[PDB]
Design a protein around this motif. Structure first.
Motif, PDB file in Angstrom:
ATOM      1  N   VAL A   1      23.383   9.131 -11.040  1.00 40.87           N
ATOM      2  CA  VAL A   1      24.000  10.120 -11.917  1.00 40.87           C
ATOM      3  C   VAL A   1      25.346  10.593 -11.384  1.00 40.87           C
ATOM      4  CG1 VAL A   1      23.710  12.390 -13.004  1.00 40.87           C
ATOM      5  CG2 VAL A   1      21.756  10.835 -12.781  1.00 40.87           C
ATOM      6  N   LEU A   2      25.423  10.869 -10.084  1.00 42.91           N
ATOM      7  CA  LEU A   2      26.635  11.360  -9.437  1.00 42.91           C
ATOM      8  C   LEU A   2      27.514  10.265  -8.834  1.00 42.91           C
ATOM      9  CD1 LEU A   2      24.971  14.480  -7.840  1.00 42.91           C
ATOM     10  CD2 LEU A   2      26.165  14.252 -10.044  1.00 42.91           C
ATOM     11  N   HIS A   3      26.947   9.100  -8.537  1.00 42.73           N
ATOM     12  CA  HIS A   3      27.677   7.993  -7.936  1.00 42.73           C
ATOM     13  C   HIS A   3      28.402   8.454  -6.676  1.00 42.73           C
ATOM     14  CE1 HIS A   3      26.793   6.077 -11.792  1.00 42.73           C
ATOM     15  NE2 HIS A   3      27.276   7.172 -12.346  1.00 42.73           N
ATOM     16  N   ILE A   4      27.662   9.177  -5.828  1.00 43.30           N
ATOM     17  CA  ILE A   4      28.246   9.802  -4.639  1.00 43.30           C
ATOM     18  C   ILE A   4      28.888   8.759  -3.725  1.00 43.30           C
ATOM     19  CG2 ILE A   4      27.616  10.879  -2.453  1.00 43.30           C
ATOM     20  CD1 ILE A   4      27.873  13.016  -4.415  1.00 43.30           C
TER      21      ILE A   4
ATOM     22  N   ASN B   1      32.210   7.418  -5.003  1.00 43.06           N
ATOM     23  CA  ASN B   1      33.271   8.415  -4.995  1.00 43.06           C
ATOM     24  C   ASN B   1      33.679   8.815  -3.583  1.00 43.06           C
ATOM     25  OD1 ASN B   1      34.160   9.449  -7.739  1.00 43.06           O
ATOM     26  ND2 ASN B   1      31.934   9.218  -7.991  1.00 43.06           N
ATOM     27  N   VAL B   2      32.734   8.856  -2.647  1.00 50.24           N
ATOM     28  CA  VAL B   2      33.122   9.044  -1.255  1.00 50.24           C
ATOM     29  C   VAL B   2      34.015   7.893  -0.822  1.00 50.24           C
ATOM     30  CG1 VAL B   2      32.284   8.865   1.113  1.00 50.24           C
ATOM     31  CG2 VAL B   2      31.195  10.497  -0.516  1.00 50.24           C
ATOM     32  N   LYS B   3      33.626   6.662  -1.171  1.00 49.52           N
ATOM     33  CA  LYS B   3      34.426   5.496  -0.804  1.00 49.52           C
ATOM     34  C   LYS B   3      35.850   5.623  -1.324  1.00 49.52           C
ATOM     35  N   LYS B   4      36.011   6.126  -2.546  1.00 48.65           N
ATOM     36  CA  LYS B   4      37.330   6.252  -3.157  1.00 48.65           C
ATOM     37  C   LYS B   4      38.239   7.217  -2.404  1.00 48.65           C
ATOM     38  CE  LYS B   4      35.799   5.072  -7.826  1.00 48.65           C
ATOM     39  NZ  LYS B   4      35.555   3.729  -7.214  1.00 48.65           N
ATOM     40  N   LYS B   5      37.681   8.110  -1.589  1.00 49.23           N
ATOM     41  CA  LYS B   5      38.481   9.103  -0.882  1.00 49.23           C
ATOM     42  C   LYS B   5      38.592   8.820   0.610  1.00 49.23           C
ATOM     43  CE  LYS B   5      39.764  12.498  -3.801  1.00 49.23           C
ATOM     44  NZ  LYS B   5      38.804  13.584  -4.177  1.00 49.23           N
ATOM     45  N   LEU B   6      37.909   7.797   1.107  1.00 48.23           N
ATOM     46  CA  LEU B   6      37.888   7.529   2.538  1.00 48.23           C
ATOM     47  C   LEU B   6      39.254   7.032   3.021  1.00 48.23           C
ATOM     48  CD1 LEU B   6      34.359   6.057   3.292  1.00 48.23           C
ATOM     49  CD2 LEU B   6      35.370   8.247   3.990  1.00 48.23           C
TER      50      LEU B   6
ATOM     51  N   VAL C   1      30.720  16.269  -6.981  1.00 49.95           N
ATOM     52  CA  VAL C   1      31.082  14.987  -6.388  1.00 49.95           C
ATOM     53  C   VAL C   1      32.429  15.088  -5.668  1.00 49.95           C
ATOM     54  CG1 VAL C   1      31.618  12.609  -6.941  1.00 49.95           C
ATOM     55  CG2 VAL C   1      29.663  13.704  -8.036  1.00 49.95           C
ATOM     56  N   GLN C   2      33.379  15.805  -6.257  1.00 48.98           N
ATOM     57  CA  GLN C   2      34.687  15.958  -5.622  1.00 48.98           C
ATOM     58  C   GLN C   2      34.618  16.750  -4.328  1.00 48.98           C
ATOM     59  OE1 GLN C   2      37.981  14.850  -7.528  1.00 48.98           O
ATOM     60  NE2 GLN C   2      38.730  16.939  -7.790  1.00 48.98           N
ATOM     61  N   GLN C   3      33.878  17.857  -4.330  1.00 50.30           N
ATOM     62  CA  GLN C   3      33.750  18.639  -3.107  1.00 50.30           C
ATOM     63  C   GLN C   3      33.067  17.827  -2.018  1.00 50.30           C
ATOM     64  OE1 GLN C   3      31.643  22.164  -4.342  1.00 50.30           O
ATOM     65  NE2 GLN C   3      33.502  23.143  -5.161  1.00 50.30           N
ATOM     66  N   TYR C   4      32.042  17.066  -2.386  1.00 49.18           N
ATOM     67  CA  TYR C   4      31.336  16.251  -1.405  1.00 49.18           C
ATOM     68  C   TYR C   4      32.264  15.184  -0.812  1.00 49.18           C
ATOM     69  CZ  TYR C   4      27.102  13.977   0.559  1.00 49.18           C
ATOM     70  OH  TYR C   4      26.151  13.429   1.394  1.00 49.18           O
ATOM     71  N   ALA C   5      32.977  14.451  -1.670  1.00 43.92           N
ATOM     72  CA  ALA C   5      33.883  13.401  -1.200  1.00 43.92           C
ATOM     73  C   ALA C   5      35.022  13.962  -0.353  1.00 43.92           C
ATOM     74  CB  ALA C   5      34.445  12.614  -2.384  1.00 43.92           C
ATOM     75  N   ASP C   6      35.622  15.082  -0.771  1.00 48.74           N
ATOM     76  CA  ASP C   6      36.688  15.675   0.034  1.00 48.74           C
ATOM     77  C   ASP C   6      36.158  16.121   1.388  1.00 48.74           C
ATOM     78  OD1 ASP C   6      38.482  15.239  -2.008  1.00 48.74           O
ATOM     79  OD2 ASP C   6      38.574  17.343  -2.653  1.00 48.74           O
ATOM     80  N   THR C   7      34.931  16.641   1.421  1.00 41.50           N
ATOM     81  CA  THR C   7      34.360  17.057   2.697  1.00 41.50           C
ATOM     82  C   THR C   7      34.191  15.867   3.642  1.00 41.50           C
ATOM     83  OG1 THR C   7      33.158  18.824   1.526  1.00 41.50           O
ATOM     84  CG2 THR C   7      32.488  18.331   3.797  1.00 41.50           C
TER      85      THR C   7
END
Length: 187
Positions: free
Chosen positions: A38-41, A44-49, A174-180
């Protein structure tokens, strides 16, 4: 406003030699289904690494009893064959949505339907390479003394704390998680 104890926590005993970003999950875990399907965490984390930061994803034994151990072995097969991207969705759906994955042969059926040849799956399933990949997943979890999934660790030192993020909006979460993760990966 990144604060130890809000968006993440810091390990009391840091782990040496851990992967840069380590995610643990179970196909048996309803919160893991939410994270991935649902969130594709992970995506999306990969996209910000940052450039040169690798993401490792390991399955855990401690949910689902016998089937949970079988699912860790299947994830090892998926890693050994490089087909994680073909089996994650059907494995999550078979365990949690249709609940048609009740045994090791139901797991194998997902791989066959995804186009992995039966002889390839079976040779991998019984291989010492896969046994080694199972042991690696178990060891990684033992290092951080893992007690729950979904979980994510950065540099063997920081653990993500999703309870401190906004759950009124799935995209914000998802954005807050990936930025963190990106923040922690930069130390």
């Amino acid at each position: 406003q990144y604060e130890d104890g809000k968006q993440y926590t810091t390990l009391e005993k840091p782990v040496a030699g851990a992967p840069q970003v380590l995610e643990f999950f179970s196909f048996f875990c309803p919160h893991c289904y939410q994270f991935e399907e649902v969130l594709h965490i992970s995506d999306n984390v990969k996209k910000k690494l940052p450039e040169g930061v690798k993401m490792t994803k390991y399955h855990v034994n401690f949910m689902g009893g016998d089937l949970g151990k079988d699912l860790t072995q299947a994830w090892a097969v998926a890693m050994a064959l490089g087909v994680e991207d073909k089996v994650t969705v059907p494995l999550f759906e078979g365990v949690q949505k249709t609940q048609t994955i009740r045994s090791a042969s139901d797991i194998r059926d997902v791989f066959i339907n995804a186009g992995i040849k039966g002889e390839e799956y079976d040779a991998a399933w019984n291989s010492f390479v896969v046994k080694s990949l199972v042991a690696q997943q178990e060891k990684a979890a033992a290092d951080v003394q893992l007690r729950g999934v979904p979980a994510m660790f950065v540099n063997g030192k920081y653990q993500l704390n999703p309870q401190g993020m906004d759950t009124s909006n799935m995209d914000v979460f998802v954005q807050q998680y990936a930025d963190t993760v990106k923040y922690l990966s930069e130390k």
